[PDB]
Structures are given as C-alpha cells and as structure tokens.
Amino acid sequence: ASKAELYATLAEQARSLVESEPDLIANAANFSALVYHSLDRLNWAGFYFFDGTELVVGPFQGKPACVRIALGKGVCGTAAQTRQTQVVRDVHAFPGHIACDAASESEIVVPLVAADGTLIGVWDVDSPVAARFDDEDRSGMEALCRVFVEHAWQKARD
Amino acid sequence: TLSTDPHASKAELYATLAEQARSLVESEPDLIANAANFSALVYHSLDRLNWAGFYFFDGTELVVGPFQGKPACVRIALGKGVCGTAAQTRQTQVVRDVIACDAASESEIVVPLVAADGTLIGVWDVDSPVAARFDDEDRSGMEALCRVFVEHAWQKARDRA
Numbered sequence: 336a337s338k339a340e341l342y343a344t345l346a347e348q349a350r351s352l353v354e355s356e357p358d359l360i361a362n363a364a365n366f367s368a369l370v371y372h373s374l375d376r377l378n379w380a381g382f383y384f385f386d387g388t389e390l391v392v393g394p395f396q397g398k399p400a401c402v403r404i405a406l407g408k409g410v411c412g413t414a415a416q417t418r419q420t421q422v423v424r425d426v427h428a429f430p431g432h433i434a435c436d437a438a439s440e441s442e443i444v445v446p447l448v449a450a451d452g453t454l455i456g457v458w459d460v461d462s463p464v465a466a467r468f469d470d471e472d473r474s475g476m477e478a479l480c481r482v483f484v485e486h487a488w489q490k491a492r493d
Numbered sequence: 494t495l496s497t498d499p500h501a502s503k504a505e506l507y508a509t510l511a512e513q514a515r516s517l518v519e520s521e522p523d524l525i526a527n528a529a530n531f532s533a534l535v536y537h538s539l540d541r542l543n544w545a546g547f548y549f550f551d552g553t554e555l556v557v558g559p560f561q562g563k564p565a566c567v568r569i570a571l572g573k574g575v576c577g578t579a580a581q582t583r584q585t586q587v588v589r590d591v592i593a594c595d596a597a598s599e600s601e602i603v604v605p606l607v608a609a610d611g612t613l614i615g616v617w618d619v620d621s622p623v624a625a626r627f628d629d630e631d632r633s634g635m636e637a638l639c640r641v642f643v644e645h646a647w648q649k650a651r652d653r654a
Contacts, residue, residue, distance in 0.1 A: 352564070356568075360559070361556050361557045361568075364557060364559050364560055365557065365564050368560070369564055381529070394525070394558075394559040394560075397533065398537050402521055402526055
C-alpha cells in the first residue's frame, strides 16, 4: 500500500477509535498502537506530554526511552520549543540529539498544540533505518495528530 | 544467540526484572510515565509475548491504560472476560488455552492491582501467542513485578497526595 493510502485509512480509523472514547490515556495508548502496527520499519511511536515545564513520556510503543525531555534538547525538545514539525533523516547528525534517543536512525516529531495555543506535547515516531520519513509522512502524521488533538485532547479538556 | 551464556531460571529472571522495574520507576513521580515504561520494560524482557499492559478501574469499569501490542479492548465491565473476571474476583487469572481481546492470544495471565486501602487500581494483563506460555512460576513472577509497580509507582504517588 502507498503512503497516501495508508494515511487516508489511518486518519479515518484514528477518528473512529478516539471519538467513541472519553479517556485521554486510553486514546493515546490506542492511537500509538494503531500507528505503530500499521507502518513498517518503525521502532518507537508515542506521546510526550508537557507538564508545564518540560516533556514527560506518555503512552508509547517500543523499548523504554527518554522519560523527561527539556524544551530545546534533542529532536523532541526542539519540536516542542519551536512548535515546528521535525523530519530527521539522520538522527546521528541532528545537533543536540540526546543519549536516550540513540536507538533511532531517523525520526519524525509533530508538536501538539491546543486551539488556545497551549503546548500539549509532541507525537514522536522513530525508525532504525535511515531516511524513513519524508514530507508525505509530514502530511500524513500531521493529519493523524490533528484527529488526536481535536477528538481526543480537545474533547477531554472540555 | 550465544549458548554458552548463563541461563537463569524463571525465578532468577523475574527477580532481575523486578530490580530493573524498581530502578525504572523509583524516582519518577508521574504515574502514567511509570505505567508506560513498566509495560515497555516487561514486554521487551520476556520472550513469546504479544501483549502486555494495564487496564485501570475508573470507578465503574476497566479502561485500557498504557500497553505494548496491537489495539485490544478499550473498556471492560467487571466480570466480563479474563480481565473483567480478574478485576471482580480480585484473583489472579492464569489461562493455558484461550472472549476478547487480543485475537492472536493463546495464553494469558491477568494480575489484579489493589491499593493499600483496598481500592481496586486495575489489572495487569499479559498475553502470548503460544499455548500454555505461563505456568505457576510466571504467576509468582508477574505478581512480584506488579508489587513493584504498585509499591514504587502507584502507592508512592497516592501517599504523597
């Protein structure tokens, strides 16, 4: 299946899954499981949630990794501080990449921002192969995260 | 790989994993982070597993928390299925041959999680695609792992409130 097909399907599956469920933790864990087992050549997929000061890991699929990430530090901290998606083809060349993120060869991080500008956290996907993610994954991952923010986080906050 | 390495028994392996679990959660205050990391640690330390994670009691029924594996059940009523049976009976369930959730599961162990004051926290659920993957040594080992999580993550956070 092409990337365009996979992300179109994932977007509707994700919306179906989280709209029918109030609990944010359930929705974050099921979302991580859905994406992780639908895309090949991944070794990590999951959430970090902002605690008012820094990122703190939430539900994820993969091996134990970073537990806390300061804003500005590494790919995830850079995404949270700049509020810009990070598409990294070679994590070992990303300036300031952090030790607990060493299992990843390439990475995509989408910042999650509430409608009122509050930093929610980041969505982080890692691969053990080089240049796994391109700008179509940028489009596709961001569409999945918009579903999550609108129909899981924004709902529970209200 | 490397057959000449030391080959530990189930008791020793679960004891080593309990110390790792203790070290992983001891100093982190956030309960959801510890639950996510604990699920990841156990799932990747034991072989022949296809699911490992938490369902948390919301006061009425079980609601899935952090887990490793494909999407499974989201909500489970008390008394329904292996996990709901564990939560209601407050008894550990060991199933050698598998209603719901992870379809590929052939054997399963569910450990109820109960607070110091008797509150039902939820359950810890692990599945294998192999028949009779879990025996009474796995039963004892999983219960010891869950004591670490309840003591050094859940009860720790509750007592600070």
